[PDB]
Design a protein around this ligand. Structure first.
Ligand SMILES: [Mn+2]
Ligand SMILES: [Mn+2]
Ligand SMILES: [Zn+2]
Ligand SMILES: [Zn+2]
Ligand SMILES: [Zn+2]
Ligand SMILES: [Zn+2]
Lengths: 162, 162
DNA sequence: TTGACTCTCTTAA
DNA sequence: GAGAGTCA
DNA sequence: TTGACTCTCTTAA
DNA sequence: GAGAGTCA
């Protein structure tokens, strides 16, 4: 199996390639009526994507390296976390975009957490709006807000109490 | 069935049957260090469930009625909303548990909203902790909190900025 | 060894 | 969070 | 007509 | 949010 040195070499090659991705400046809500700036390193929309990268789904990619004649492959956003525990509280760790921009591979925009923690960031009020995530959000979640509920709780008769 | 009268009759028979489900009291976090009380009307764990009800999944049920000699069937939590639009902004409307208790069929604990709005209530701080849902939450979402993130944003080299 | 495609799977609403 | 079919 | 089961599907992380 | 196969 791959040694610590070899894993570090994979992480270094990945950072070197992703660093050359187009860097896109995005203005984003931080919460509390404030605006901030994130710099996303975005994988191209179509091939070629960069050395070692290939698209396996509409917004899914993989990173591949061949070491000592053995092909190794990882989810494209998982590479920064190859030296980290891969589960916690009995839940699989997932790459989680703090910038909510799937094409971005900036490791400063990623964290490594359960799928539930990951999803929940979609509704976070943001780092200036009351975020309580221990690994703080970089921005207000895209789905934060009052929502668009069509109908609320209601009854026709008198069979129920809240 | 097609007629408003037939729909109201479906809603009324559904409410009468559900009104006979056992009422279970649940004490719940509201946010802000406060606690409240909900009264859930819980479908039985095993057959028989009640007139018109049958289980199609571990925590999925359907309500069925014969109208004009034809069988009509609905997801068991959708019946209160049969007179409401079934989509919003091009997204399917879903029955959404404000009590986060799938067996509960209390319509005073249900709303009708997109799957995204529905999911997002899992992380809401709650009605006394800052909920901004226009149709207000009845409790703090069960997944609200700091999370259990294993690793935060990081880079080995100097190629990235936030 | 490498790129560019292909397929199906996980989770919890 | 859903829809629909098989049996009795 | 009603009940009690079976199966697969949707969505967006 | 994932893993793995095929072909050249
Ligand atoms: Mn995410
Ligand atoms: Mn829900
Ligand atoms: Zn980014
Ligand atoms: Zn947050
Ligand atoms: Zn309830
Ligand atoms: Zn809320």
């Amino acid at each position: 199996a791959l040694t610590n040195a070899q894993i570090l070499a994979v992480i270094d090659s990945w950072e070197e390639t992703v660093g050359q991705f187009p860097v896109i400046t995005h203005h984003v809500p931080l919460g509390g009526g404030l605006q901030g700036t994130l710099h996303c390193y975005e994988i191209p929309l179509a091939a070629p994507y960069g050395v070692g990268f290939a698209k396996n789904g509409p917004t899914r990619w993989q990173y591949k390296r061949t070491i000592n004649q053995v092909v190794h492959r990882w989810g494209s956003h998982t590479v920064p976390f190859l030296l980290e525990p891969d589960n916690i509280n009995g839940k699989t760790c997932t790459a989680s975009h703090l910038c909510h921009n799937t094409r971005c591979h900036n490791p400063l925009h990623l964290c490594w957490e359960s799928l539930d923690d990951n999803k929940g960031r979609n509704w976070c009020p943001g780092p200036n709006g009351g975020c309580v995530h221990a690994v703080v959000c970089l921005r207000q979640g895209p789905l934060y807000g009052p929502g668009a509920t069509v109908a609320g709780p209601q009854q026709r008769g008198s069979h129920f109490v809240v």
